[model samples]
Target: TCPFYKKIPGTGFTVDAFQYGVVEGCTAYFLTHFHSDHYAGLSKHFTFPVYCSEITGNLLKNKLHVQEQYIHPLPLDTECIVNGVKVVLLDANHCPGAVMILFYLPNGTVILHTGDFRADPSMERSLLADQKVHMLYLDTTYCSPEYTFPSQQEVIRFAINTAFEAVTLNPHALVVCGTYSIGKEKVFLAIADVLGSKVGMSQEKYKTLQCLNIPEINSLITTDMCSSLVHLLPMMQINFKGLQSHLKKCGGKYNQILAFRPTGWTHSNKFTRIADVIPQTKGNISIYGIPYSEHSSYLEMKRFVQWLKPQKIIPTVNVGTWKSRSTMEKYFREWKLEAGY
Candidate 1:
């Protein structure tokens, strides 16, 4: 998402724009998660104060080295006054500390900014669950018709069974779980949990996890190359070339490699169901793309938008250009008309 994408339209407040220097009339900066695409503009210090969740703030400070005074981590489901607008943080269900930002203006206008999220029925517990939203900045990463997929829970179960069966036959296979800096943790951890193995990862990844201090996260981590059967690495590194290189470095310890890439794009949503999706095999390497995505699918996003029944909807993720923005808005208008909202 573009950080300086029109300055939240009318409000002086900016959401997830840290790269641009000396922004005009920028009052406060809000970050939803620790993802690079959203937190790219931030630096060690900035002109304005940054507001985010405590977990996001921890990663912001620990990883990005932002100053503590400039970073204000807000509490969840509670309202706080910021420059005359009341703000509240609701769980985004995307990552550890990601939140859907709620802005209550002086005129009682309710604006919900879902920085990036996967829609779940559990979000009904929000403070403004049933309230009429004046505006909604949605995470329309998968707003297109072709991005339909299953729930995260269903996907995870499929992955566990697949991984379990694969590891059962190939006991010495290296289980590589592809991930970003702070995501796809559920797939890797669940696979490791069912298999009873340690997660080998880079120090930087481990240090980022340490910032959260969540339960049972540390026990799964191991720096020892031999001790860990599953290795969590960047998605780019799960390719054939990357896997080949790493396997060679292992010095013939593991005969084959089994990798799972937690992604939304590589998957084929048209042809087959989750179980019917086939894995690609190149020599001794088996590549599988799991739809354990953090962002909502097309159907999920539609459900979330329909339930909120906001008067207006804005695309946050795929609105970089006028054409793309209009395409997403067209989807919104179509949904709005069909629902008669």
Candidate 2:
């Protein structure tokens, strides 16, 4: 199935489905992560046996909220045979459950598929070390040279520095910074460590942690899990009037409050309403924003595309059809890159 052509059996015409499903004759469906775009439609009508990481299975269980069914939970960095195709689950630091899938077919061709991923230094190091990769199905969300996006470290630093200034400058004020829940949890964890506090997770976030059952990494929680300085609140009640008063009475005035967007990069507009709800206190409320994204920046994308020199680089999510594709193609052309399959 090449890009820009749809299967019409014999008509020689095809439709662009925009990449979210299994082919009829395909032998398997391996999930790279549990993100909405990656896994949302499979459960609705697709009935093929699905392959996922243990973390993803746990999330799908929580997501579908249905009684358990047959599922294959592949462990990280392990190789297994699925319907005759040998597969490996590798680390993809998109979120905790995010994974990269390497599909080795019997024909001796190996294809590496990345579910929405960042060129995480950790992940890149791992990929570069592996010599078996032949064809890479990349997550090309930001595959341009002109786009300017910052990395996670820079964004987190911006958020934490601002948060510290806000809390220290106004002792009586609440410092609430909004970020995405899944990825932002890690950011807040780093921030908490810096502030001599532990990051806190809302009930929903705690449930996500519980579902994963990670013994190695500490869970961000509602109560201070490690020290007295850390704190958390449910996303819904983050700014509840009564809760705010209660927290203030209990020395919460000395603590910094943060709200994370439930979904990461893809659905930023989803958090617009919640962002609007931040209390407008004269000197009591302060907010700061950092342009953080899990996907690659245009710079990173350009670098990788330039480095890998892949025969084709198809950006999965984009502005549809002639206009969108042409605009994206135009940018690629500026860099001497052609439209990819």
Candidate 3:
């Protein structure tokens, strides 16, 4: 299971680590999925054979850009053993390749390690299919009951409507916005649905959208359609060196730039202020920020845990020991509202 802690060999100090150890005679390691938090640590150490869902494995290769030989891939819903730990890889619909792991330990304990997941009714059925799960390494990311998250579809719709409103009100200008490299492709899809013929994506964005197999993206636009677009709606591929040049070109084409990266506009020294571009020191560039999120909100996280019904639910992705205590009490126990726990 993820977040397996081990004491430092001679120090009696514990470290946040995967519990899978070959010392237990386990033949392989079952990686829940390839999200940076889960898969990134593999590069640090450990040499046990790894098993993951095929999609997760491919994600490790494509998204994480890791070598194929480092970890082994397994198909979804299949039973396998890695390092003597019996395992099953289940779909976690949080992201494209996210998954929940189920392990049947040699000691007859059926453990479920759900990485970052959400409350999808359909996903709940997948949980039921694996009857007699003994322990579940749950995702308490939003474990507190007070967290009421807008659904993903709703968030996408809001982004589209917001972007559309921005472009429609400002004529004679195309628009470009930022989102994640992979999962944020859906936000782009929603934008396409709303903007229709008015939007145009960069070739690099198109390639990423295609690589992710975003369900017939080509049918959405034509070469002529792209060239004649009134609004060049491009997603901000984070840290891409091409953004400045792309903005300059969009400027030449009389288009506007919208930054959809929610975290980008936060109170951090890392980001440039929107004031630098919008109305452009007396020029015509425009940009705006909207509320968007991928992870579960507080309310959604509570539902998932309540339904799963685990005996000993330990929150791994905790902010601090103090907050963690309050979170468990308010959300899981009292159902009280404690803002931002």
Candidate 4:
């Protein structure tokens, strides 16, 4: 259900599981991004050199406390060789430093590992029509039909509008935005820009955003909660009991607290729109979950597979042992078969 890693069959290079310990005769290690789950056990004391996007590499050193000397930062669209195999990095469009990898093997077999990404039109246009991909390691995080949500910009708009509505509904209420430590910076920043106000964040989150060196974001971040009407906190802290616990600690300083979690999960079970405004109440706090995600939806995934038409497909995240196979089988119904397998 979590944490998948693979080694190219012939090349001894491992992908995205550096902290899992070096495998026997491992030649190289590749990291797709700096998400803690993907980089599970990486530590400052580790002694292996790792390759990843320049932004991700810097984040690893600055945030994860990894030494700078061990990180090999690779630029997008640039080709480099590792242990006689050619490698290129491409934008994954999932997070700031997320990337997809293309490996040109010595045997003329091309492989693509989609670390984590949404459907990118540029990626579709970049691949040659006649180019043959031996295998594709797919990101099936939202392969189901229920994940049909609007574009990221639209979701950001929804979040901003919702925040404004919450404030209007209760002028004295404090609005707490539930966002991931890293990924949802765009949503928070958009809200701040539109409202023309600074956003409060913890020291760690502010530090992480500062390292990004985005002038707009850096200017909007503040450590003082009272400095801003909206406070951006870790998404994990916005739950029912969590909010209740926090309100108790506040000792009636706030008239009320409105929390919003921007995630794709809210779109499941039923299709919800921004105007719907379904709020869950817990004591003095009200929380809402907005449908916002970076992963490709079912139609997007299907379109991506049809365009690539790789010889074989492997899912990176699956629900069960055979879930990927069955899911792909259903989605790839139009795929041309090379006769009976």
Using all chains and alpha carbons, the TM-scores for the candidates as numbered come to 0.93, 0.69, 0.69, 0.88
TM-score of decoy 4: 0.88
lDDT of 3 by residue, 49-78 (tens): 556666566655654455667658776777
List model 2 lDDT by residue over 117-197, tens digit each.
776545556544565555556665666544455557656666567556655665443433343334545556655656655
Which has the greatest lDDT? Answer: 1
Candidate 1's TM-score: 0.93
How much is 67 displaced in model 4, in angstroms?
Answer: 1.4
Q: Which ten residues in a row have the lowest lDDT in candidate 2?
A: 5-14
Model 3 misplaced stretches (Cα beyond 4 Å): 1-26, 41-48, 62-65, 81-85, 127-130, 165-171, 197-213, 217-246, 262-288, 335-341
* Cα lDDT tens digits for candidate 1, 79-178: 7987767788998888899898888776778888888899887776678676778988888888888887887888999988988888899888888888
What residue runs in model 4 are displaced by over 4 Å at the alpha carbon? 1-5, 127-131, 168-170, 213-215, 244-253, 267-269, 282-284, 333-341
Locate the minimum summed-lDDT window of 10 residues in model 3.
6-15
lDDT of 1 at 33: 87
lDDT of each: 0.82, 0.54, 0.53, 0.75
- Residues 257-335, candidate 4: write the lDDT tens digits: 8887877655343655655667888677788777767788877877777777778877787746676669666665545
